[PDB]
Short mmCIF file of N, CA, C and O in Angstrom, two decimals:
data_model
loop_
_atom_site.label_atom_id
_atom_site.label_comp_id
_atom_site.label_asym_id
_atom_site.label_seq_id
_atom_site.Cartn_x
_atom_site.Cartn_y
_atom_site.Cartn_z
N UNK Y 128 -4.46 5.69 -7.71
CA UNK Y 128 -5.59 7.05 -7.27
C UNK Y 128 -6.49 6.27 -6.37
O UNK Y 128 -7.43 6.65 -5.79
N UNK Y 129 -6.41 5.34 -5.64
CA UNK Y 129 -7.06 4.68 -4.54
C UNK Y 129 -6.45 3.34 -3.92
O UNK Y 129 -6.30 2.35 -3.47
N UNK Y 130 -5.68 4.61 -2.67
CA UNK Y 130 -4.47 3.95 -2.12
C UNK Y 130 -5.50 3.22 -0.30
O UNK Y 130 -6.90 2.95 -0.97
N UNK Y 131 -5.18 3.19 0.64
CA UNK Y 131 -5.86 2.31 1.43
C UNK Y 131 -6.12 3.35 2.47
O UNK Y 131 -5.84 3.67 3.87
N UNK Y 132 -7.19 4.83 2.02
CA UNK Y 132 -7.44 6.12 2.57
C UNK Y 132 -5.97 6.13 3.37
O UNK Y 132 -5.89 6.27 5.06
N UNK Y 133 -5.14 6.91 3.25
CA UNK Y 133 -3.72 7.13 3.85
C UNK Y 133 -4.08 8.37 4.62
O UNK Y 133 -5.24 8.48 4.72
N UNK Y 134 -3.04 8.84 5.23
CA UNK Y 134 -3.77 10.29 5.80
C UNK Y 134 -4.35 9.49 7.31
O UNK Y 134 -3.76 9.20 8.14
N UNK Y 135 -5.48 9.68 7.24
CA UNK Y 135 -6.37 9.53 8.29
C UNK Y 135 -6.80 7.75 8.31
O UNK Y 135 -7.29 7.14 7.78
N UNK Y 136 -5.60 6.93 8.22
CA UNK Y 136 -5.96 5.83 8.79
C UNK Y 136 -4.70 4.91 9.47
O UNK Y 136 -4.03 4.88 9.26
N UNK Y 137 -5.23 3.10 9.95
CA UNK Y 137 -4.41 2.32 10.87
C UNK Y 137 -4.05 1.33 10.06
O UNK Y 137 -4.95 0.76 9.27
N UNK Y 138 -2.65 0.40 10.33
CA UNK Y 138 -2.68 -0.97 9.80
C UNK Y 138 -3.39 -1.67 10.53
O UNK Y 138 -3.42 -2.46 11.63
N UNK Y 139 -4.42 -2.15 9.61
CA UNK Y 139 -5.32 -3.41 10.40
C UNK Y 139 -5.61 -3.26 11.97
O UNK Y 139 -4.75 -3.66 12.73
N UNK Y 140 -6.44 -3.09 11.98
CA UNK Y 140 -6.94 -2.51 13.77
C UNK Y 140 -7.31 -3.97 14.35
O UNK Y 140 -7.43 -4.82 13.46
N UNK Y 141 -7.74 -3.93 15.65
CA UNK Y 141 -7.78 -5.15 16.59
C UNK Y 141 -9.85 -5.35 16.06
O UNK Y 141 -10.12 -6.31 16.63
N UNK Y 142 -10.49 -3.89 15.53
CA UNK Y 142 -11.92 -4.36 15.61
C UNK Y 142 -11.53 -4.48 13.88
O UNK Y 142 -12.04 -5.14 13.28
N UNK Y 143 -11.05 -3.94 13.25
CA UNK Y 143 -11.34 -3.72 11.21
C UNK Y 143 -11.15 -5.43 11.19
O UNK Y 143 -11.58 -6.14 10.34
N UNK Y 144 -9.64 -5.68 11.44
CA UNK Y 144 -9.11 -7.26 11.52
C UNK Y 144 -10.23 -8.25 11.83
O UNK Y 144 -10.39 -9.45 11.37
N UNK Y 145 -10.66 -7.97 12.82
CA UNK Y 145 -12.49 -8.72 13.70
C UNK Y 145 -13.30 -9.44 12.05
O UNK Y 145 -13.48 -10.16 12.04
N UNK Y 146 -13.01 -7.66 11.78
CA UNK Y 146 -14.48 -7.80 10.10
C UNK Y 146 -13.72 -8.98 8.90
O UNK Y 146 -14.57 -9.59 8.50
N UNK Y 147 -12.50 -9.14 9.59
CA UNK Y 147 -11.77 -9.79 8.44
C UNK Y 147 -11.91 -11.60 8.66
O UNK Y 147 -11.98 -12.11 8.21
N UNK Y 148 -12.09 -11.65 9.87
CA UNK Y 148 -12.07 -13.01 10.73
C UNK Y 148 -13.70 -13.17 11.11
O UNK Y 148 -14.24 -14.55 11.43
N UNK Y 149 -14.74 -12.42 10.49
CA UNK Y 149 -16.09 -12.73 10.65
C UNK Y 149 -16.57 -12.94 9.46
O UNK Y 149 -17.25 -13.96 9.10
N UNK Y 150 -16.79 -12.04 8.82
CA UNK Y 150 -17.28 -12.03 7.15
C UNK Y 150 -16.42 -12.84 6.42
O UNK Y 150 -16.59 -13.14 4.81
N UNK Y 151 -15.15 -12.64 6.65
CA UNK Y 151 -13.76 -13.35 5.87
C UNK Y 151 -13.22 -14.17 6.62
O UNK Y 151 -12.15 -14.04 6.62
N UNK Y 152 -13.86 -15.30 7.67
CA UNK Y 152 -13.38 -16.10 7.44
C UNK Y 152 -12.59 -17.28 7.25
O UNK Y 152 -11.83 -18.28 7.51
N UNK Y 153 -12.53 -17.03 5.73
CA UNK Y 153 -11.73 -17.64 4.46
C UNK Y 153 -10.57 -16.72 4.09
O UNK Y 153 -9.57 -17.15 3.85
N UNK Y 154 -11.16 -15.71 3.60
CA UNK Y 154 -10.27 -15.12 3.16
C UNK Y 154 -8.96 -14.16 4.20
O UNK Y 154 -8.37 -13.73 4.06
N UNK Y 155 -9.53 -14.77 5.54
CA UNK Y 155 -8.72 -14.19 6.76
C UNK Y 155 -7.51 -15.71 6.88
O UNK Y 155 -6.44 -15.42 8.06
N UNK Y 156 -8.03 -16.78 6.32
CA UNK Y 156 -6.80 -17.99 6.66
C UNK Y 156 -6.70 -18.53 5.51
O UNK Y 156 -6.48 -19.96 5.32
N UNK Y 157 -6.91 -18.01 4.29
CA UNK Y 157 -6.52 -18.65 3.08
C UNK Y 157 -5.56 -18.46 2.26
O UNK Y 157 -4.34 -19.29 2.06
N UNK Y 158 -4.93 -16.75 2.14
CA UNK Y 158 -3.74 -16.59 1.89
C UNK Y 158 -2.51 -17.29 2.54
O UNK Y 158 -1.84 -17.70 2.12
N UNK Y 159 -3.16 -17.63 3.87
CA UNK Y 159 -2.35 -18.70 4.64
C UNK Y 159 -0.94 -17.89 4.32
O UNK Y 159 0.09 -18.45 4.26
N UNK Y 160 -0.75 -16.64 4.03
CA UNK Y 160 1.04 -15.93 3.60
C UNK Y 160 1.85 -16.52 4.73
O UNK Y 160 1.34 -16.85 6.29
N UNK Y 161 3.06 -16.05 4.97
CA UNK Y 161 3.85 -16.52 5.93
C UNK Y 161 4.42 -15.09 6.28
O UNK Y 161 5.38 -14.63 6.86
N UNK Y 162 3.40 -13.97 6.28
CA UNK Y 162 3.55 -12.92 6.80
C UNK Y 162 2.61 -12.40 7.68
O UNK Y 162 1.60 -13.19 8.25
N UNK Y 163 1.93 -11.14 7.38
CA UNK Y 163 0.69 -10.37 8.74
C UNK Y 163 -0.09 -10.04 7.68
O UNK Y 163 -0.36 -9.04 7.84
N UNK Y 164 -0.43 -10.56 6.77
CA UNK Y 164 -1.75 -10.00 5.85
C UNK Y 164 -2.42 -10.97 5.81
O UNK Y 164 -3.63 -10.94 4.49
N UNK Y 165 -2.86 -11.62 7.11
CA UNK Y 165 -3.90 -12.30 7.15
C UNK Y 165 -5.23 -11.90 7.59
O UNK Y 165 -5.49 -12.10 9.24
N UNK Y 166 -5.91 -10.96 7.64
CA UNK Y 166 -6.73 -9.60 8.45
C UNK Y 166 -6.90 -8.46 8.38
O UNK Y 166 -7.01 -8.87 6.68
N UNK Y 167 -7.39 -7.85 8.79
CA UNK Y 167 -7.79 -6.43 8.13
C UNK Y 167 -6.57 -5.71 7.64
O UNK Y 167 -5.22 -5.82 7.85
N UNK Y 168 -6.30 -4.94 6.67
CA UNK Y 168 -5.11 -4.57 6.21
C UNK Y 168 -5.35 -2.84 6.85
O UNK Y 168 -4.36 -2.43 6.89
N UNK Y 169 -5.92 -2.03 6.98
CA UNK Y 169 -6.52 -0.82 7.71
C UNK Y 169 -8.21 -0.41 7.71
O UNK Y 169 -8.65 -0.84 6.61
N UNK Y 170 -8.06 0.87 8.22
CA UNK Y 170 -9.11 1.43 7.97
C UNK Y 170 -9.06 3.29 8.43
O UNK Y 170 -8.44 3.71 8.94
N UNK Y 171 -9.28 3.85 7.02
CA UNK Y 171 -9.51 5.32 7.32
C UNK Y 171 -10.36 5.99 7.79
O UNK Y 171 -11.09 5.16 7.76
N UNK Y 172 -10.49 7.01 8.52
CA UNK Y 172 -11.70 7.39 8.52
C UNK Y 172 -12.09 9.03 8.60
O UNK Y 172 -11.19 9.50 8.31
N UNK Y 173 -13.06 9.21 7.81
CA UNK Y 173 -13.85 10.43 7.06
C UNK Y 173 -14.78 10.56 7.26
O UNK Y 173 -15.85 9.91 6.93
N UNK Y 174 -15.51 12.02 7.76
CA UNK Y 174 -16.93 12.41 7.79
C UNK Y 174 -17.65 12.22 6.49
O UNK Y 174 -16.99 11.31 5.70
N UNK Y 175 -18.44 12.64 6.38
CA UNK Y 175 -19.34 12.86 5.21
C UNK Y 175 -20.75 13.45 5.58
O UNK Y 175 -21.22 13.97 4.69
N UNK Y 176 -21.82 12.48 6.26
CA UNK Y 176 -22.85 13.10 6.88
C UNK Y 176 -23.16 11.96 7.44
O UNK Y 176 -24.33 11.62 7.34
N UNK Y 177 -22.44 11.37 8.44
CA UNK Y 177 -22.55 10.16 9.21
C UNK Y 177 -21.23 9.27 9.45
O UNK Y 177 -21.35 9.10 10.83
N UNK Y 178 -20.69 9.70 9.03
CA UNK Y 178 -19.16 8.97 9.04
C UNK Y 178 -19.01 8.24 8.48
O UNK Y 178 -18.80 6.78 8.40
N UNK Y 179 -17.71 8.55 7.31
CA UNK Y 179 -17.50 7.57 6.11
C UNK Y 179 -16.33 6.59 6.86
O UNK Y 179 -15.68 7.21 7.52
N UNK Y 180 -16.18 5.49 5.89
CA UNK Y 180 -15.31 4.77 6.53
C UNK Y 180 -14.46 3.67 5.25
O UNK Y 180 -15.13 3.18 4.72
N UNK Y 181 -13.57 3.76 5.71
CA UNK Y 181 -12.57 2.88 4.27
C UNK Y 181 -12.08 1.60 5.09
O UNK Y 181 -10.76 1.73 5.24
N UNK Y 182 -12.79 0.57 5.23
CA UNK Y 182 -12.10 -0.37 5.25
C UNK Y 182 -11.12 -1.64 4.53
O UNK Y 182 -11.56 -1.99 4.11
N UNK Y 183 -10.21 -1.13 3.90
CA UNK Y 183 -9.30 -2.00 3.25
C UNK Y 183 -9.29 -3.16 3.67
O UNK Y 183 -7.91 -3.13 4.88
N UNK Y 184 -9.20 -4.22 3.66
CA UNK Y 184 -9.35 -5.53 4.66
C UNK Y 184 -7.94 -6.08 3.55
O UNK Y 184 -7.71 -6.35 2.30
N UNK Y 185 -6.74 -7.03 4.26
CA UNK Y 185 -5.91 -7.18 3.94
C UNK Y 185 -6.00 -9.24 3.89
O UNK Y 185 -6.16 -9.55 4.94
N UNK Y 186 -5.51 -9.77 2.97
CA UNK Y 186 -5.81 -11.30 2.58
C UNK Y 186 -4.37 -11.92 2.39
O UNK Y 186 -4.17 -12.61 1.68
N UNK Y 187 -3.57 -11.09 2.07
CA UNK Y 187 -1.96 -11.58 1.75
C UNK Y 187 -1.14 -10.85 0.91
O UNK Y 187 -2.02 -9.72 0.74
N UNK Y 188 -0.19 -11.21 0.80
CA UNK Y 188 0.39 -10.65 -0.32
C UNK Y 188 -0.13 -10.42 -1.73
O UNK Y 188 0.18 -9.63 -2.57
N UNK Y 189 -1.23 -11.80 -1.55
CA UNK Y 189 -1.64 -12.17 -3.36
C UNK Y 189 -3.17 -11.71 -3.10
O UNK Y 189 -3.65 -11.65 -4.11
N UNK Y 190 -3.57 -12.24 -2.24
CA UNK Y 190 -5.01 -12.15 -1.70
C UNK Y 190 -5.05 -10.51 -1.77
O UNK Y 190 -4.78 -10.28 -0.99
N UNK Y 191 -6.38 -10.25 -1.37
CA UNK Y 191 -7.02 -8.88 -0.82
C UNK Y 191 -8.34 -8.45 -0.91
O UNK Y 191 -8.84 -8.67 -1.69
N UNK Y 192 -8.96 -7.69 0.24
CA UNK Y 192 -10.23 -7.47 -0.06
C UNK Y 192 -10.69 -6.05 0.34
O UNK Y 192 -9.71 -5.27 0.64
N UNK Y 193 -11.76 -5.49 0.52
CA UNK Y 193 -11.83 -4.11 0.48
C UNK Y 193 -13.40 -3.69 0.80
O UNK Y 193 -14.38 -4.43 0.96
N UNK Y 194 -13.16 -2.62 1.85
CA UNK Y 194 -14.96 -2.41 2.06
C UNK Y 194 -14.81 -0.93 2.58
O UNK Y 194 -13.92 -0.76 2.84
N UNK Y 195 -16.15 -0.63 2.73
CA UNK Y 195 -16.29 0.23 3.20
C UNK Y 195 -17.34 0.99 4.27
O UNK Y 195 -18.49 1.26 3.82
N UNK Y 196 -17.08 1.07 5.59
CA UNK Y 196 -17.99 0.95 6.50
C UNK Y 196 -18.51 2.30 6.29
O UNK Y 196 -17.75 3.42 6.32
N UNK Y 197 -20.13 2.61 5.78
CA UNK Y 197 -20.37 4.40 6.15
C UNK Y 197 -21.89 4.15 7.01
O UNK Y 197 -22.57 3.79 7.14
N UNK Y 198 -21.79 5.11 8.07
CA UNK Y 198 -22.93 5.37 8.58
C UNK Y 198 -24.12 6.04 8.46
O UNK Y 198 -23.93 7.24 8.73
N UNK Y 199 -24.46 6.25 7.24
CA UNK Y 199 -25.22 7.36 6.92
C UNK Y 199 -25.94 7.83 7.82
O UNK Y 199 -26.60 7.34 8.35
N UNK Y 200 -26.05 9.16 7.35
CA UNK Y 200 -27.04 10.01 8.70
C UNK Y 200 -26.84 11.50 8.24
O UNK Y 200 -26.26 12.11 9.12
N UNK Y 201 -27.19 12.14 6.51
CA UNK Y 201 -26.73 13.20 6.46
C UNK Y 201 -27.96 13.82 6.46
O UNK Y 201 -28.44 14.68 6.05
N UNK Y 202 -28.60 14.20 7.83
CA UNK Y 202 -29.06 15.06 8.80
C UNK Y 202 -30.38 13.97 8.61
O UNK Y 202 -31.62 14.52 9.62
N UNK Y 203 -31.01 13.51 7.09
CA UNK Y 203 -32.30 13.08 7.07
C UNK Y 203 -32.74 11.60 8.00
O UNK Y 203 -33.00 10.99 8.35
N UNK Y 204 -31.24 11.11 8.37
CA UNK Y 204 -31.11 9.84 8.96
C UNK Y 204 -31.60 8.69 8.22
O UNK Y 204 -32.83 8.55 8.50
N UNK Y 205 -30.82 8.25 7.45
CA UNK Y 205 -31.60 7.04 6.60
C UNK Y 205 -30.53 5.68 6.70
O UNK Y 205 -29.61 5.00 6.18
N UNK Y 206 -30.85 4.77 7.81
CA UNK Y 206 -30.10 3.76 8.34
C UNK Y 206 -28.49 3.82 7.51
O UNK Y 206 -28.05 5.37 7.61
N UNK Y 207 -27.68 3.17 7.68
CA UNK Y 207 -25.94 3.00 7.39
C UNK Y 207 -26.36 3.02 5.53
O UNK Y 207 -27.15 3.16 5.23
N UNK Y 208 -24.64 2.65 5.45
CA UNK Y 208 -24.24 1.94 3.94
C UNK Y 208 -23.29 2.08 3.91
O UNK Y 208 -22.44 2.10 4.83
N UNK Y 209 -22.80 1.01 2.98
CA UNK Y 209 -20.77 1.09 2.66
C UNK Y 209 -20.75 0.77 1.42
O UNK Y 209 -21.01 -0.68 0.52
N UNK Y 210 -20.59 1.61 0.93
CA UNK Y 210 -20.00 2.04 -0.78
C UNK Y 210 -18.77 1.41 -0.62
O UNK Y 210 -18.49 0.45 -2.22
N UNK Y 211 -18.18 0.23 0.12
CA UNK Y 211 -16.96 -0.37 0.41
C UNK Y 211 -17.69 -1.74 0.35
O UNK Y 211 -18.38 -2.21 0.97
N UNK Y 212 -17.07 -2.46 -0.58
CA UNK Y 212 -17.46 -4.30 0.32
C UNK Y 212 -16.85 -5.33 -0.83
O UNK Y 212 -16.79 -5.01 -2.35
N UNK Y 213 -15.75 -5.95 -0.48
CA UNK Y 213 -15.02 -7.12 -1.86
C UNK Y 213 -14.26 -8.21 -1.54
O UNK Y 213 -14.10 -7.95 0.32
N UNK Y 214 -14.64 -9.32 -1.94
CA UNK Y 214 -13.39 -10.29 -1.23
C UNK Y 214 -11.95 -10.16 -1.76
O UNK Y 214 -11.49 -9.36 -1.90
N UNK Y 215 -11.54 -11.44 -2.20
CA UNK Y 215 -10.06 -11.55 -2.46
C UNK Y 215 -9.93 -11.82 -3.64
O UNK Y 215 -10.36 -11.76 -4.64
N UNK Y 216 -8.69 -12.90 -3.85
CA UNK Y 216 -8.34 -13.62 -4.99
C UNK Y 216 -7.73 -12.41 -6.07
O UNK Y 216 -7.93 -12.16 -6.96
N UNK Y 217 -6.43 -11.84 -5.70
CA UNK Y 217 -5.99 -10.95 -6.34
C UNK Y 217 -6.83 -10.09 -7.49
O UNK Y 217 -6.62 -9.63 -8.40
N UNK Y 218 -8.14 -9.82 -6.65
CA UNK Y 218 -9.04 -8.72 -7.31
C UNK Y 218 -9.06 -7.13 -6.77
O UNK Y 218 -8.66 -6.75 -7.38
N UNK Y 219 -9.38 -7.52 -5.82
CA UNK Y 219 -9.57 -5.80 -5.18
C UNK Y 219 -7.83 -5.31 -4.80
O UNK Y 219 -7.46 -4.33 -4.19
N UNK Y 220 -6.85 -6.18 -5.34
CA UNK Y 220 -5.76 -6.41 -4.91
C UNK Y 220 -5.51 -4.31 -5.56
O UNK Y 220 -5.71 -4.10 -6.06
N UNK Y 221 -4.49 -3.78 -5.05
CA UNK Y 221 -4.14 -2.34 -5.48
C UNK Y 221 -3.15 -1.60 -4.38
O UNK Y 221 -3.25 -1.75 -3.35
N UNK Y 222 -2.48 -0.90 -5.21
CA UNK Y 222 -1.26 -0.56 -4.42
C UNK Y 222 -1.81 0.10 -3.37
O UNK Y 222 -2.67 0.64 -3.07
N UNK Y 223 -0.93 0.54 -2.39
CA UNK Y 223 -1.32 1.78 -1.20
C UNK Y 223 -0.32 2.43 -0.69
O UNK Y 223 0.52 3.10 -1.31
N UNK Y 224 -1.09 3.42 0.02
CA UNK Y 224 0.07 5.05 0.25
C UNK Y 224 0.35 4.64 1.78
O UNK Y 224 1.61 5.04 1.55
N UNK Y 225 -0.14 3.98 2.69
CA UNK Y 225 0.03 3.74 3.93
C UNK Y 225 0.06 2.22 4.27
O UNK Y 225 0.69 1.58 5.39
#
């Protein structure tokens, strides 16, 4: 019940994956897997009241991180928010829909 924001979401963007090389400069080259799972995993986009963002970051087939970028602004305009955020180490691991 917690996929990578399927439906509206892409496979690690050139932007989202940059987040994996910024705050995750270890989780991005740690798993050092022999595939393409060393970067962002995907980012789904859905409004809410500012524009919610589901940044599921990829850390390899064994490690995996996650985030939810949110530009909070439900009319009252109160800075942003990030109900999502996680490191890796088979912790935030979780099946995905896309």
